[PDB]
Structures are given as C-alpha cells and as structure tokens.
Amino acid sequence: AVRQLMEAGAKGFEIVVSGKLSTERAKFEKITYGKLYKIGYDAKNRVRRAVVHVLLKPGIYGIEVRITPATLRYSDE
Amino acid sequence: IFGEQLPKTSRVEYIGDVPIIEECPRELKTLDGNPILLFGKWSFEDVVVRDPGLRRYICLKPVVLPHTEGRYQKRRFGKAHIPIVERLVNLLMRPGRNTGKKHKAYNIVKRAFEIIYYKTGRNPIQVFIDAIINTAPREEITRIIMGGIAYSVSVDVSPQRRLDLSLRWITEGARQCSFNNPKPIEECLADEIMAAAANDPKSYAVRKREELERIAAASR
Amino acid sequence: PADVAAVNPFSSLMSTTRKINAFELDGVVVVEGGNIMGVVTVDDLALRPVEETLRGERVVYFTKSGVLRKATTGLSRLRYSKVGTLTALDVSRPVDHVANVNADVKEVLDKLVEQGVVPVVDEQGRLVGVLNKMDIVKDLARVYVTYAM
Amino acid sequence: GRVKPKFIKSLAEKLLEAYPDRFTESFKENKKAVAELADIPSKTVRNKVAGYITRLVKRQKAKE
RNA sequence: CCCCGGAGGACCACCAGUGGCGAAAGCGGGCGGCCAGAACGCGCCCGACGGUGAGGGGCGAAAGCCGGGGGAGCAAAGGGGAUUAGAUACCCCUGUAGUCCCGGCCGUAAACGAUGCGGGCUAGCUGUCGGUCGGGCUUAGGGCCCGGCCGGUGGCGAAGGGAAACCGUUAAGCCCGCCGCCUGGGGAGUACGGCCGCAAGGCUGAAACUUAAAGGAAUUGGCGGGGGGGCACCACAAGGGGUGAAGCUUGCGGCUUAAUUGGAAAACCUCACCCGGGGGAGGUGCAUGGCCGUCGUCAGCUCGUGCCGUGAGGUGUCCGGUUAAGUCCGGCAACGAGCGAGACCCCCGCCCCUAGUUGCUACCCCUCCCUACGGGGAGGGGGGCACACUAGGGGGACUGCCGGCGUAAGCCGGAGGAAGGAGGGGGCCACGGCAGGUCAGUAUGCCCCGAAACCCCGGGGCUGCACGCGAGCUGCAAUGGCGGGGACAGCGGGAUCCGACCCCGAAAGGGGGAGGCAAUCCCGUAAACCCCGCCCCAGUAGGGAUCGAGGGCUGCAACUCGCCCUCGUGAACGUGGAAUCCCUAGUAACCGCGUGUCACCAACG
Ligand SMILES: [Mg+2]
Ligand SMILES: [Mg+2]
Ligand SMILES: [Mg+2]
Ligand SMILES: [Mg+2]
Ligand SMILES: [Mg+2]
Ligand SMILES: [Mg+2]
Ligand SMILES: [Mg+2]
Ligand SMILES: [Mg+2]
Ligand SMILES: [Mg+2]
Ligand SMILES: [Mg+2]
Ligand SMILES: [Mg+2]
Ligand SMILES: [Mg+2]
Ligand SMILES: [Mg+2]
Ligand SMILES: [Mg+2]
Ligand SMILES: [Mg+2]
Ligand SMILES: [Mg+2]
Ligand SMILES: [Mg+2]
Ligand SMILES: [Mg+2]
Ligand SMILES: [Mg+2]
Ligand SMILES: [Mg+2]
Ligand SMILES: [Mg+2]
Ligand SMILES: [Mg+2]
Ligand SMILES: [Mg+2]
Ligand SMILES: [Mg+2]
Ligand SMILES: [Mg+2]
Ligand SMILES: [Mg+2]
Ligand SMILES: [Mg+2]
Ligand SMILES: [Mg+2]
Ligand SMILES: [Mg+2]
Ligand SMILES: [Mg+2]
Ligand SMILES: [Mg+2]
C-alpha cells in the first residue's frame, strides 16, 4: 500500500495509523515522502486529507492520509 | 562632529566651533506675513531657550493649537518635533480616568497660561520655558550590583531625558496638589510653573531635581 | 545602643527574629559598613508571608562566584540542600526617618509610631542608636519604680 | 527587506545566466523582463528577484 | 607605622626549564674536604666472568613511638569571636604536641609511568641536556650556529597492537629469557594462627553465608550554585495603567447538608445529586480515535551520495560575519536536497479600469421661512455618477537611488515616496513529546449496573456560609457630583422577528401599528466629550452596600430562587501591606454600542 502510490507520480504523501496496533499502548506509526507541504495555503485547503477510523478488535485505529497528485503544482517556481 | 548627514527640517547654528542644532523651525508666519499665536494669544517669536542641549529638543515651531495626532513616537528622537506646549497637555491625561481627554487638558493649560500672564506680566510660553531650565536635572543615579546589595552610581542625563523629567515633575507636582483639597487643577498647575520658573524650593519640581542631584553627589 | 539592636543585611530571618524577641524590641536597623540600609520591625513582619521562606519554598544562596541567587522551589527544582531562608535586608523596608541625639525625643514621637523604629545618628551622620516604642515604656516604668516603691 | 532566502537567490541567479544580456542596472527594466522571462505568480517574489538581479549587474560592472 | 642596634629558628625567591642527578624514597644558597654512580672519547686490560631470581637480606615520604636538644613561622587537640535550625565544620583571634637536630623504632602511601628486570629488530619530524667529531663565526671564552654519532629527557606520528581511551625506538609492536601476581561481586585486608613491633599497629590471610551482577572505555541525552554566545514586554531597563485593602458579582477549596454533582444565561428542562413515586451524563483519558492546549512570541528535524569509526554513533547541521529564521555570505570532508522559516492566504492603507433598481448631491427648478436686503436656509422633484461610497481586476515597495562601512550576507543615516525596511493586523502549527485535556460532544475496547441509568415525574439541591485563594464591577471624589443644553461612529442583528409613528402612564411599562425576508424598513439623534448653572474638602449635594413600603415584565410556575421602576433609608470606604499582572502607536488607558449565551436576566466572552 505504498508502492500503490508509487504507481502514481505523487510528489508527496503521509500515512498515519494511530491506535493500539500491537499492545495496549497506542504507538502512532507513520510513513512520509518528499515534496509535501505541511502548512500554509496548500495544507488544509489544496492538499488532500481524509481521516477515517476503523473498529478492530479493541478498535478505533484512526487513519490519517495526506496525498498530492503529480499535477498539483503549488505556488513555487 | 558628524559624518552621517542630517535630516531636513534641522538647522545648524555654528557658534565658535560648537554645532548647535535645532530640530524645529522657529520661522513660520502666515502667507500675509503675520505671526502665529499659541491659543491665538501668545507669540513664539520672543521666546528664547537659554539652554544649549535643550535647544535641540524643545520644539518652538509656531502652532495655533498644540495638537499633533501622536505621530512622532514611531522614530527614536521623534519627540523633538512634538511642540513643547503639547507635551504639557499630553502629561495632564493622568491618572487612568483622564486618559484620552485632550480637550480637558487643553483647557487646563490654556486657562493656566492666562493666569500665568496676568499674575506675572510675562509671556506664558516664556515662563514655562524657564520652568523647565530651572527644573531639569543634570545628574542622575543608576543601579549597580556588588554581589547581593544594589548600590548606586552617578551618571549624566542626556538632553532628551532632562526634558522628560522636568515635564513629568511639573505635571505630577501639580496633580498631587489638586487631589482631595478644594484647589482647582489649573490654579495648581499655574502656581507650580510660576514657582519653578522662579527657582522656589516650594515647588514639587525643584524639590525633585534637588533630591536627585543631591543623591548623585553622594554616590559619584 | 548600636550593637544590641543593629543587624547585618545578610542576617538570617530566624536570627533577627530571635534577636528581636529576646531583647524586647519593636524593630532593628539593617546596617552594613555604617550604612542604614533599612529597618525590620515586628508589625510589618507580622503581615508578611514568612511561612514560605521558613518552609524551603523561598531560598537564597551564594554561588561559587559571589552572586546571590534567591531562587524559588517548585517551579523546576525542589531540592536545594545547603541554603538559607531570607536575609534581614529582604524582609526589611527602606528607612525613611532618622533622629539626632542632640534633639528632643518629642520631635520624633509622631514619626516613631508610623515607622515603628527610628535610627539615631551623631554629628558624623553615622548610626549610633535606635529609638523604639518600648524605650519610652521603660522610661515610664522608671518613674513609678523611683516613686511608689 | 532583511535577507533574501534561497528560492529568491536560486531563482535570480539562474535567470541571469540564461539571459545575461537582458538585465540592466535599473530596477524598472529588470522588473519587466523577469515577469516575462519567469513564471512568477507572486508580486513580491517578482520584485525581490528583480531587485536582486539589479545588484549582480552592479557588482559585475563594478568588477570590470 | 618610621629609624638605630641585638638575638633566634626555618628557608634558599628571580635565574628556573615535561632542566639535572639518583634504584626507589628523594636532592635547589656559597666555599671547602672525603666519597659514590654514570655518559662520552679510546688499536688500554681480562676473556663469557652474563640475565632473572623462590627462600634470605638491605634501603624506604608523611604521620606516629622511645630518650635528649631546640623552638621563628605554621599548626592536630583545646580556648574564644562569629555564622547557623543545629555548627562539637567551613572564617577570624589564640593555641599544645608536631613540624627542626641527634641516636633508635616503625615499614606504610594515588611509595604512580597505576606500565617488573635484561637483550635484539622495526619510517620519520621536531624541542632540549651531556660528551665527541666535521664546517662556519667569534664578547678570542669552558663562547655561538650548522651537520654526524653515542647517551638521556618531552611532543607529533609509520608499521603494528588495543574494548576503546590510546601505545608507538623512552612500545602497550615482532621476538628471546626469568621472577611476581589474577581467575565474578559482597562477606573482607574481616576471623583464626604465626611472625614482627615499645606501642600504634604491620605482614601473611580464609571460610560459612549472600548474591546476578559489580566493572572498563566510549555514544546520545539530562543536569550543574561550570564556561561562552543569542533571544523575548507570557523577561528586565525607561514608562503607563493597574491587582493585592472596602462593598458587591462570580469560580474553586474548605465548612455545613438529605443533597449541596462530576470534572481539571440553573426557578421546570438542563441534571449528572437528595427525598417520594412510575440502554447507560456508570468506571478506566495509564486501553483508544478525533479534536484541542503547550513545548512553540521556537528554529528545529531529516535525506541522497561521499568521508571517520569494529560499534552505539559522528560529518554535513561546525567556525566567522548577518537576522525574525537551520536566513544568508565566507572558511572547512563534505557537495546537494526536503519539510519547518519564508513564499502562500484573508483584512487595512495609496493609485488606475470596469459599474451606478440600490447608495452620493457639485447643477438645476417649486414651495416654506428669515432677511441688515444682498442673499441665506430647510423640504419636493428633476438631471448626473462629478465627488464620495460600494465591489471585482490590476498597479505600487524592490534595500530601488544617494553617503558610509563590509570581500559579501547585510547593516546605519538620507532623499523621494500614499506606504520603508518582512509596510500594519491575523490564518496555516515541522519531527517528537508533555501516561498533558477531553469515555459528561459524538465514537469506541475492557470491567461493571441488568425490567435499574431514564432527556421520567413532584419537590428540593446545584444559590446553603466562620474562612482561604483567583478573576472582575464601582467607588473613595473637585481633571469631580448633580441639573440643563449641543453634538459626533462603526460593526452587528432582525420573521414571526426588528420594530417607525400615534395614544396612555410619573417611571418601569401598556395599547394600536407603517415599513422591512435586507446599501431600500428598523434597532439608530451612543457614551465619554463641549457649554452653561448649583455644590466647595466634608464620610460630604462623594459612596451606593443593606433594609422598609409600593408598581410592573417573562413564564405553566418567581417563596427558597428571576429581572425593571418609584419613595425612603445612607454601611464600609478618605487611594490600599508583603507581593504581583499587562502593555511599544491609532497601541495603553477611558467611553459607549452590537452581538453569543437567551421565554426572562451579562458585573462574562
Ligand atoms: Mg507561512
Ligand atoms: Mg475627601
Ligand atoms: Mg623476595
Ligand atoms: Mg616524619
Ligand atoms: Mg597563629
Ligand atoms: Mg609552640
Ligand atoms: Mg602498582
Ligand atoms: Mg590490555
Ligand atoms: Mg604516540
Ligand atoms: Mg594481603
Ligand atoms: Mg592476627
Ligand atoms: Mg552532552
Ligand atoms: Mg519595570
Ligand atoms: Mg479587592
Ligand atoms: Mg567542519
Ligand atoms: Mg421546583
Ligand atoms: Mg456553581
Ligand atoms: Mg437555596
Ligand atoms: Mg459614578
Ligand atoms: Mg478599579
Ligand atoms: Mg450620527
Ligand atoms: Mg428614523
Ligand atoms: Mg441600541
Ligand atoms: Mg454621607
Ligand atoms: Mg451621590
Ligand atoms: Mg415588597
Ligand atoms: Mg423571588
Ligand atoms: Mg432613591
Ligand atoms: Mg475610614
Ligand atoms: Mg489598587
Ligand atoms: Mg438575540
């Protein structure tokens, strides 16, 4: 599920799966990529983000995803 | 002694060798050529500032009502352009219940300037100028630490600081005289300026400058 | 007398408190090198919050450089080891009124009640004695001891 | 202006050497060419790049 | 303190050094006498006579012991002055052994290079000491400089070695000999025995028992009453206003209570609590998600390739200048790059274009009024978008120009400019944390209550009150109080809601009701402020708590427990201790207005 985004030429992504992944203490795993802005205009308005939570056996295990397609040219040239 | 140029509106009055500097233009008349009167009554032309360093920071530019909008505090030494009579008005807006009431303070100084002229027969702008010269301190004290007990040490006061201290003592001298007694504030301010102009110890301003300079002599 | 009722500005709080109580005074003068740095009395001390400094909550200590720290516990560090409480210059208030030995005692009775204690100076201006409210009480007891017994 | 960051500096340096003969020692002409010679969707960055590229010409012309 | 003299004991300043000598301990003034041991130079003598060395012996700091002499300074013990909670310590005054000499004993030390002694081999560069040889000079000197050899004494560093620090011809390298010592920690240099000693004590030296580590070097961090630099009105300096004290509003704690509910815009409902009656607002925010606060008025965090290192890890990211910035410029084993910073996004400020059912009024005409007689003013309509206003797009500012400094990043002054150094105000919250806040916003695991949780009902409570702490209001007055008079905004809200205007009433308020579903109608002619008159330093014509009588509004309901008005009553309080908070310009402070919450009510946002 990372090479799936490597099929696309996305210049940035950020996956955050937060919960009791293996033990009773939540751990917050996260994998990121390169040219992905985090604050200012692109973030929160022009960069895709969609947070979903999935009920596993204990279960909330919220997933946060931030992606940007290969043509989402933000104001930098 | 300078190599950094100088803004316009300034003026150098080289005397012997010393470059006396005035930041405000004394020369302003109407288009006809008539003089401009403070409150429509008093003339700036005969007014002299006897003190060389204080000549730079007392703005005797002729204005009718001393009301600049508060547009000279942005830049360091921008207080040189605020007219000297408006500095007196700006120090009457205390305590906190009188802040921003410039019309009230304008009437107090105006009525005070009338009392000054009749009781003294002198130019009300001039007598206030001599109040500052007889009030502004020439030495001060500073904090110093020697490993637990903060002593003092004498220093010089810059010519801008002297004007801020003479003015504050005059206005705070008059303001305490008017609190919790029947004497009106304009009468208090008029008597305070007239006393300090005459170098009378009874005035609050002369006492304050005497204590500060007396303390400095001990703590050289 | 000067020695019995003066203190040094770095005298600890408990030391000056015990010196106040033991000698039956209203206050003492804080002097260092013949300089009257202030006074500390019982009335001003009564309303001061001295439970903090005699609880480890407010400590002063000299560094190995000379500086006086005056730190407060709980805001970061709670253990301080070999520290003092608060010197007599800290709970003192700055002196206002001084009396001359060549004067009549009546001239400072009004000032004495407001200040609680008044230092006394000689021709040189140096500290010589301290006038307390209890001294005149001793004066009043002297008359009755002279007369009625 | 206090200090020009890299994306002002990297952008300005590249535009000079690609078109070394299209930049004069005046800010006004340099502002025009930069807006036509670079994708510049920001008024401030265009002026900052144009002001800086005014300054290479002075030092380059001061060098010779 | 100064001068003239005397006596006494200890020490040998500078020169003076990783200098010298010695086996170690140790040895520092000069002259002399008696000895010792080395280095160098040598076609001198002997001819393996050597190395190490169990046991055996000798020397061996300081303190200490025995007996004698001596005793200046210092100084265990002790005496006193202070400090301190204590202070039998640290400081000060004083002080006796001791320190010094002689004869003897002790026989220990971080007695250390923590490195046994002897020999050989293995790049070098550099300082210095002794001897000697060659060359060059001569303070013509036993003197100086250059180079070689031998022997010492330091530093850097081949090969090599090492866990690493590091050693490296003065080895901890490659070898050849011999002696000593070690075999996890604690128990323990303890017990018993023996020997030694005048004694203190010394040497030699276990075990039971107990235990899973103790320990070396190095890395990242944390921390320091270690050093250096940078920065910030949630720091200070310079200021302004305050809070802390009074009365009152309000939040928490405690107290009381049947209950005063549970966490860190209250009469019902809310409601979670008490009394009576008929699925979880129950726990665990150390089981979680999401969201949020703070670190963070930060500038930090990383990656590609390279390089150092066995490794954890370094480097870049360090240094110097610069700044808001890990922003840049210049040097470096680094060269580039990404997120964060910025750029970006809203609003303010100046100019231009577009546009004028709504908004604006220069220009007209009709009325009314006044008219010093010329004119003025107000209303209605027209015309117009000119002005202003509204709203979209665009322009403008860039350290751009000038002077100085700087290699240069850039900094300081000046001019012009609406606007000047990021123009002003704000949004977006980097990695990673704070076992931070939230299962009472929703969601959710686990555990519990289980025809019992229920947003059921009636009533009460959350409003109880000696007191503590926090945030506030209005005051103490005269820069004021009161009474009349004159004004001048900007947001924002309005549907069964805003409500013009009319009537009623002394006020609160009551009745009718145009217009407006919005630049159109309304809230809406704000207060501070200005002007005039009364008050005159007094607990008062300041203050307005508390209390008595009465009148109204909302609502199903107003006592506990709502809000508004009238008349009367006039408490503390005379500017607030230790302490403490905020703030850099249209800002602080003061003044009002709109609105959220809302049936009614804001001392709150
Ligand atoms: Mg930004
Ligand atoms: Mg009064
Ligand atoms: Mg032996
Ligand atoms: Mg000895
Ligand atoms: Mg002594
Ligand atoms: Mg002795
Ligand atoms: Mg050893
Ligand atoms: Mg080894
Ligand atoms: Mg080495
Ligand atoms: Mg042994
Ligand atoms: Mg034994
Ligand atoms: Mg460290
Ligand atoms: Mg301050
Ligand atoms: Mg209070
Ligand atoms: Mg480096
Ligand atoms: Mg009820
Ligand atoms: Mg409550
Ligand atoms: Mg109640
Ligand atoms: Mg009032
Ligand atoms: Mg107040
Ligand atoms: Mg208006
Ligand atoms: Mg109207
Ligand atoms: Mg209103
Ligand atoms: Mg009264
Ligand atoms: Mg009143
Ligand atoms: Mg009633
Ligand atoms: Mg009621
Ligand atoms: Mg009344
Ligand atoms: Mg009173
Ligand atoms: Mg106060
Ligand atoms: Mg409403």
UniProtKB/TrEMBL annotation, chain B:
Organism of this sequence: Pyrobaculum calidifontis (strain DSM 21063 / JCM 11548 / VA1)
Annotated gene: rps7
SUPFAM superfamilies for this protein: Ribosomal protein S7
This protein's UniProt keywords: Metal-binding, Ribonucleoprotein, Ribosomal protein, RNA-binding, rRNA-binding
Binding, Mg(2+): N180
Residue ranges of domain Small ribosomal subunit protein uS7 in the record: 55-220
Family listed: Belongs to the universal ribosomal protein uS7 family.
InterPro entries tied to this protein: Ribosomal_uS7, Ribosomal_uS7_arc, Ribosomal_uS7_CS, Ribosomal_uS7_dom, Ribosomal_uS7_dom_sf, Ribosomal_uS7_euk/arc
Intrachain disulfide bonds: C24-C59
GO terms assigned for molecular function: rRNA binding; structural constituent of ribosome
Coiled coil: none
Protein name: Small ribosomal subunit protein uS7
GO biological process, one term: translation
Top-rank taxon, per record: Archaea
Primary role: One of the primary rRNA binding proteins, it binds directly to 16S rRNA where it nucleates assembly of the head domain of the 30S subunit. Is located at the subunit interface close to the decoding center.
Assembly: Part of the 30S ribosomal subunit.
A single cellular component GO annotation: small ribosomal subunit
TrEMBL record, chain C:
Highest taxon listed in the record's lineage: Archaea
Name of the protein this chain belongs to: Signal-transduction protein with CBS domains
Residues of the full protein shown: 493 to 641 of 655
